[PDB]
Scaffold this active site. Sequence first.
Site, PDB file in Angstrom:
ATOM      1  N   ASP A   1       1.145 -10.700   1.964  1.00  0.00           N
ATOM      2  CA  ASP A   1      -0.099 -11.183   1.373  1.00  0.00           C
ATOM      3  C   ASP A   1       0.016 -12.638   0.940  1.00  0.00           C
ATOM      4  O   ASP A   1      -0.937 -13.411   1.088  1.00  0.00           O
ATOM      5  CB  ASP A   1      -0.496 -10.301   0.188  1.00  0.00           C
ATOM      6  CG  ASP A   1      -0.963  -8.923   0.617  1.00  0.00           C
ATOM      7  OD1 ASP A   1      -1.232  -8.732   1.821  1.00  0.00           O
ATOM      8  OD2 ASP A   1      -1.065  -8.030  -0.252  1.00  0.00           O
TER       9      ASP A   1
ATOM     10  N   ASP B   1      23.474  27.665 -24.186  1.00  0.00           N
ATOM     11  CA  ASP B   1      24.425  27.955 -25.246  1.00  0.00           C
ATOM     12  C   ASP B   1      23.814  28.997 -26.166  1.00  0.00           C
ATOM     13  O   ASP B   1      22.592  29.061 -26.317  1.00  0.00           O
ATOM     14  CB  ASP B   1      24.770  26.683 -26.037  1.00  0.00           C
ATOM     15  CG  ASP B   1      26.115  26.767 -26.726  1.00  0.00           C
ATOM     16  OD1 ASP B   1      26.882  27.703 -26.417  1.00  0.00           O
ATOM     17  OD2 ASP B   1      26.406  25.894 -27.571  1.00  0.00           O
TER      18      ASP B   1
ATOM     19  N   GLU C   1      -6.509 -11.187  -4.427  1.00  0.00           N
ATOM     20  CA  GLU C   1      -5.427 -11.758  -3.626  1.00  0.00           C
ATOM     21  C   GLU C   1      -5.233 -13.241  -3.930  1.00  0.00           C
ATOM     22  O   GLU C   1      -4.102 -13.705  -4.126  1.00  0.00           O
ATOM     23  CB  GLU C   1      -5.697 -11.541  -2.136  1.00  0.00           C
ATOM     24  CG  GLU C   1      -5.601 -10.090  -1.692  1.00  0.00           C
ATOM     25  CD  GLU C   1      -5.907  -9.908  -0.218  1.00  0.00           C
ATOM     26  OE1 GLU C   1      -5.923 -10.917   0.518  1.00  0.00           O
ATOM     27  OE2 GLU C   1      -6.133  -8.755   0.205  1.00  0.00           O
TER      28      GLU C   1
ATOM     29  N   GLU D   1       3.316 -10.153  -1.914  1.00  0.00           N
ATOM     30  CA  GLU D   1       2.401  -9.045  -1.667  1.00  0.00           C
ATOM     31  C   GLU D   1       1.893  -8.473  -2.986  1.00  0.00           C
ATOM     32  O   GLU D   1       2.676  -8.182  -3.895  1.00  0.00           O
ATOM     33  CB  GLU D   1       3.098  -7.954  -0.850  1.00  0.00           C
ATOM     34  CG  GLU D   1       3.452  -8.369   0.571  1.00  0.00           C
ATOM     35  CD  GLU D   1       4.131  -7.258   1.351  1.00  0.00           C
ATOM     36  OE1 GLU D   1       4.425  -6.202   0.753  1.00  0.00           O
ATOM     37  OE2 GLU D   1       4.371  -7.442   2.563  1.00  0.00           O
TER      38      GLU D   1
ATOM     39  N   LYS E   1       3.709   2.756  -4.786  1.00  0.00           N
ATOM     40  CA  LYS E   1       3.418   1.554  -4.014  1.00  0.00           C
ATOM     41  C   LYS E   1       4.418   0.446  -4.315  1.00  0.00           C
ATOM     42  O   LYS E   1       4.843  -0.278  -3.407  1.00  0.00           O
ATOM     43  CB  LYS E   1       1.991   1.082  -4.293  1.00  0.00           C
ATOM     44  CG  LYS E   1       1.572  -0.114  -3.455  1.00  0.00           C
ATOM     45  CD  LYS E   1       1.513   0.250  -1.982  1.00  0.00           C
ATOM     46  CE  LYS E   1       1.232  -0.969  -1.119  1.00  0.00           C
ATOM     47  NZ  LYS E   1       1.421  -0.675   0.328  1.00  0.00           N
TER      48      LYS E   1
HETATM   49 MG   LIG Z   1      28.641  28.489 -27.149  1.00  0.00          MG
END
Ligand SMILES: [Mg+2]
Length: 1432
Positions: free
Chosen positions: A88, A1005, A50, A101, A114
């Site tokens: 913090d 496709d 910290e 923080e 987070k």
């Molecule tokens: Mg096709």
Amino acid sequence: EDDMACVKDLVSKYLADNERLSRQKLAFLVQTEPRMLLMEGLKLLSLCIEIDSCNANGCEHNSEDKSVERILHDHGILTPSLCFVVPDGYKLTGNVLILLECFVRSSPANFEQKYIEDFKKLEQLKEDLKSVDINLIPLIDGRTSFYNEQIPDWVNDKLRDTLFSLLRYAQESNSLFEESEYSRLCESLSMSGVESLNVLLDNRSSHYEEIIASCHQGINNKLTAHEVKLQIEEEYQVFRNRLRKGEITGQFLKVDKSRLLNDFNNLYVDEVTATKDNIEHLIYQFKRASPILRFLYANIGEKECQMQYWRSFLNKVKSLRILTRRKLLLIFDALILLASIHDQTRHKCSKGWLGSCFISVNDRLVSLESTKRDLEKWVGRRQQSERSNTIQPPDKNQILISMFQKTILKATAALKDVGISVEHYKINMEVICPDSYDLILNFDVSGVVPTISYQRTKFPFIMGGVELLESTDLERLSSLSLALVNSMKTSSTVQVVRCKEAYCQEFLLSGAEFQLIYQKTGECSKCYAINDNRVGEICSFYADPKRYFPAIFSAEVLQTTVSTMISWVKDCSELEEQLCNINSLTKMILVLILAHPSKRSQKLLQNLRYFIMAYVSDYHHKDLIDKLREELITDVEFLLYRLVRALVNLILSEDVKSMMTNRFKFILNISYMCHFITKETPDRLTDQIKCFEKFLEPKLEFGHVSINPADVATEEELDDMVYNAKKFLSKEGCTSIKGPDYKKPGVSKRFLSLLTSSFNNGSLFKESEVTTAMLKNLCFYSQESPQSYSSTGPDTGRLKFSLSYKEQVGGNRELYIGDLRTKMFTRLIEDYFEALSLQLSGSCLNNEREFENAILSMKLNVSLAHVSYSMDHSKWGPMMCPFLFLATLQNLIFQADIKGRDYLSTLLTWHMHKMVEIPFNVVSAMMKSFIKAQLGTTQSITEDFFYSNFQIGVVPSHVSSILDMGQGILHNTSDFYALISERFINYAISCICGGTIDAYTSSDDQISLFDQVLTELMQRDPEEFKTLIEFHYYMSDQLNKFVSPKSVIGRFVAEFKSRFYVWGDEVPLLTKFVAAALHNIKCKEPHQLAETIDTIIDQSVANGVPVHLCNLIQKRTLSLLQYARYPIDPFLLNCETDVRDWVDGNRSYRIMRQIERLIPDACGRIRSMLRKLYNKLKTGQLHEEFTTNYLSSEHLSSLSNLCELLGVEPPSESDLEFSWLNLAAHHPLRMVPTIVKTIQNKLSSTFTRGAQKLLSEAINKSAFQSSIASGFVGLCRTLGSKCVRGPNKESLYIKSIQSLISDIQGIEPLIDSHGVQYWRVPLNIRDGNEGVISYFRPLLWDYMCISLSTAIELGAWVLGEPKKVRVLEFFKHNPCDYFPLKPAAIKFLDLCVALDVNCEALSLVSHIVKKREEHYIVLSSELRLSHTRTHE
RNA sequence: CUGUGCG
Ligand SMILES: [Mg+2]
Ligand SMILES: [Zn+2]
């Protein structure tokens, strides 16, 4: 206990003597018991990270853990009620507050979650605190490791290891922590995904077992080949009987050309009261359809002045904020008015005026009367205020003169501060005469009144006269589009709508000045009016400015595109007389879709592709015509439909039979002209509503919509899910009283059994296969990692997917965006199914070799004129199901593989219980509509669902259902299912008929190629073949595969993944590629834009686009760059290329050719030296004494040394002076070694380093998206701004550098015919005034480095003499005459990268991995007109 | 606070 003493000594010795850390160190030293010692060590480590985070970014540590409101009230600032947030870090400076923080996360998913959580919390806090009028910029410091400045690396690692061992001992001794928290801390301290589920407790209850039983009940996967064949045969006999008797309706019809043309001609017969339009009448109506079209084809016919100079100067100095943004505006207006008066008195000028209004700075139209009233009021006010003190003559004229001189002096001082002198703006100070105030007040103008007609309640000119064959209309549209796009750059300041002040963009057409007038700023649709000083209010319209980019400088490109398309169908004998009309129609269509870019026009043009595919086919779906008709609203859309109908009826006439391939290509390119319209959304909210209704309606038809399910699934919801899972498998067909119900989602138990049995017994294969608060206070205690999992997902919650849309040409595609943990969970399934399909063959989705095999197979099939069946699948995403994939996988038969299949089943069941979040905008719109309806007749199905949920309280937020796969989420799994299901379907067809089908599928496709037997069955037995096609459709339906109405059976053309193949001729999508190069412009550094355009044009040349059109496109790109006034150095784009430049060579070769073109005999001596050098280094010598003796020394002196080393004639003094201006000499341009930078950026990007940087720069850009026109205006704004960085971090304009260059008279510019600039810098002046010479780079050195790189990459042939092509003599110039071409494909890597770090002109070695084209199709004439480069 | 540029 020796390790304990060693650790204590290490921490006492190597801890920093911070007073903040002293208290925690004293607390740690006194500790004896392992539990409290562990806890204090954890606190000490957390405090270390910290404090290091706070000090590194410059913030004060928050040891007291005070809330934000407490700190603000302590520091003297009062705040209202705030959400409970404990920062913090915190620091106040001036009016800037920093919160910092910090957290440490070893896992990527935990880190991302987070970071997002902290970002959301800080955004909420900032929004709450905005009322306090204190700025708050979020700052998040996430680290992937414990290393920091307080403790060295090895001591930190040893302390971590000993503390983790201590926690193990404490847990096994006293068990102070819970199993959950103990496991969490162990996983957060110990520092692939398939085994990541091993560490999670299995809480799969009876719901999973019931789902598995549902997917196993009634399914027989042990059937032998004999039983499967017998069942298929019986099914086909029953299908034949019921199709013959009419109890089952056919879905296909034999292609009738006349009937298809008639259906197309009557596509909109309710308002189009005709079917055969006269083409001349169509031209007459087109040239007068809309105000824009009226302006494009009307008779608008008719030395810089001081007004423009002063306007540009004051536009530049108004950005410097010399300063109250009301008085300097008046002064600037007065100055520009004086400049205009000076121009009119000197040479009787009239530019810059619109009647009684004139164009001032910031694009503003300013009224003369209001200007002079404000000026007199201001002058008199300061006269009566100043003279209240002393006794002097005010002399209003002299007052205005003094104010002008003071403002101009301050502007000059501010302008020279960056390095620009006022004489480069060419402003004349004699416009400020002693007679100034009287001159500006005694000034009268009488003329037209500019207006804007917001309503549509006649045209000033003759609406006809501009011919379609000429390019005048395209040039006018280009100028109007540029004005429209530039109208978005205006800064935000403050029926006949004649106004006193508006905003205007000036453009010149046919020697006449025109003004685009608007009254609203921004990138939004607004009302525009075209006005002229001769006649005011030429026209008015309601265009959207950000949809008018592609035509800005594309007149030549579009004219040549039309000419090429016409030249395709030109030798057709039947089209000889009707050849002009075609051209006109083609031109008209293009102009329309450029003048009125509409999504409906895009869809109408796109459907022509399916119409023409069916026209040349043998069988087509009976519902194709209904799908080709989408609603048209405006008159221009109906005019476009009529033009397309006329063109189609001319081209596809019954009397025309000569060259069908050419006409098919022409019509396909006409259809693909839809790509010219931008794919960006016209209205975001409407597209969101349409996406949500497409997502929701099938789930309502199926009947399973779970509204707002909890993270813990309710028992009733689980029962409903199991019921709908059983219902999905309860699809009957051909063996019931009612028969099959087509397009209903689900699969049949019989056909699922048959498919699984066929897979299991090998019939589908081929021969080639067979305390808690303190822990929360820690900056490294992970809290979001899952520890268990149920059937519905991890204990952290079910999978969330936010729903959005990806915009394409012809609509949008649904998009499901999930959390990073969800993405990793899905990647396991995706990788497993990708590998599983990789084991088999025929899937062309991810494989590139399989796609080439499909291309070869289609070419062979079309060459022999066998039957090719091109299929799309309708609603592949929404109708498919994760439970379907689960049921398929549970029955397939291929130790730890049982566990792998169990993990796959668990993940698939998680995807079954996914929650898709309704967009907030959709919910807000539904609430507003519901309120207006209930308080203040369509009531769509989604509207009814929303209204029913609204009237009963709970508002829908998330939707859960059985009937949905993420669009693109379970994409590889869908591809594998399509592969196996189609293998089974083809196997069944072979079991029925005598022929066999070879199928290639990509996930939605498919191309099916029929062998000779099926083709012959087509000719000699149409009924049997039609029944076979219907049975294929029915079998696909029974397996949840719904053949699109756009699928076609035919021998003429084969299509797969938007690639068309016919016999003899090639089918290039020329309009598609041309539009792709016209819509490819970003706000990046100009060389990156040039590289992108070069890559796109290389692909276009490979696919068959002629080289002259591509050169025109490159000229258009350089024109766009020149509008931003960026200098055109010889390293951007080569606009004189030929076929060999794109086939044989590469981008470096093209730059070499450009440089050789610029300087003719200056590259010959260098090439002789380069040939000698390449030979010497090829023999094996001189390699080590050149890369570090010549590439490390200074330039312009190593060339002569190299030449004398090799015994060749050195370059002359004239040759060594050639240079180019490198604005990125010291630092890259501010657009908001190079190879070493790329290596650093790629290394510090994955997780260990720079992960937080990438995540932050990606989330900053996530909620920031723009259009192509917005990118272009941003590029122009940046290139006009301070983008050039100097040697000492200073910021300069491009004009500053150019003025500094103009200060020196020795340096002379030289411009190519295409605008490429290179400079001659005499060697006598290169070291005295190094201020600007440092930006120059010698041209021969760059040429030599690029030539060595190209010789190494491609071969020595690039070093030969570039002899031009000889006479030829005479070859026929058939436009549809294509030739295939293939490009010719450790010690030298070091030399190449040494060349890269020395030649800051082009990215030489990084271009290898960013895919090289492996096939070229060119024109024979263009190929034979190419240059010759032979090694000698 | 960032454009004034029609090859
Ligand atoms: Mg096709
Ligand atoms: Zn003039």
